[PDB]
Design a binder for this molecule. Structure first.
Ligand SMILES: CC1(C)CCC(CN2CCN(c3ccc(C(=O)NS(=O)(=O)c4ccc(NCC5CCOCC5)c([N+](=O)[O-])c4)c(Oc4cc5ccnc-5n(COP(=O)(O)O)c4)c3)CC2)=C(c2ccc(Cl)cc2)C1
Length: 137
């Protein structure tokens, strides 16, 4: 599994499902899990999208701050879905505010975070195959 491909497909999904412009079972499962997360956590989304103040200079710090807090008490599959959903929220708020070049930077930051911070937990917990076994078709 390629974390970059996982990230790229997810962001492309988040943007196109909202009218913006920019192995398959893993992508499909993540789409379903993330759509479920956004239906169940609507109030957390509205608060994040409204409170999140972004500029090309502070975007990485904003991303890093939220993601550290999300994973502070440990990693679980639910928290990883929330990480992709948070990444999607940043991408949508970046396009909304005409800072669209930030989308490519967010994809890079999400890819590095998966490869350097989440990779250990993912493999120790069965890999993406285990996520598909728990929540997929
Ligand atoms: C950190 C901040 C600064 C502050 C707080 C926030 C908000 N905050 C909201 C709560 N949240 C967590 C954390 C952990 C779990 C958990 O251990 N899930 S889990 O591992 O037990 C688990 C069960 C089910 C599923 N899939 C089930 C579906 C069913 C339909 O088919 C597809 C699979 C998963 N999973 O990984 O897929 C996995 C969790 O529970 C879920 C996860 C889900 C993820 C998806 N749905 C799911 N449901 C909803 O399920 P329930 O009905 O059981 O409530 C509940 C929610 C953390 C983040 C911040 C913020 C972040 C992002 C944005 Cl965009 C905006 C703000 C930022």
């Amino acid at each position: 599994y390629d974390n970059r491909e996982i990230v790229m497909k997810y962001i492309h999904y988040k943007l196109s499902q909202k009218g913006y412009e920019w192995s398959e079972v893993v992508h499909l499962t993540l789409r379903q899990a993330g759509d479920d997360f956004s239906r169940r956590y609507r109030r957390d989304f509205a608060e994040m999208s409204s409170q999140l103040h972004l500029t090309p200079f502070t975007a990485r710090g904003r991303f890093a701050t939220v993601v550290e807090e999300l994973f502070r008490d440990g990693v679980n599959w639910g928290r990883i879905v929330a990480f992709f959903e948070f990444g999607g929220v940043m991408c949508v708020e970046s396009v909304n505010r005409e800072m669209s070049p930030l989308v490519d930077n967010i994809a890079l930051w999400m890819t590095e975070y998966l490869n350097r911070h989440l990779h250990t937990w993912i493999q120790d917990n069965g890999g993406w195959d285990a996520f598909v076994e728990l929540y997929g078709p």
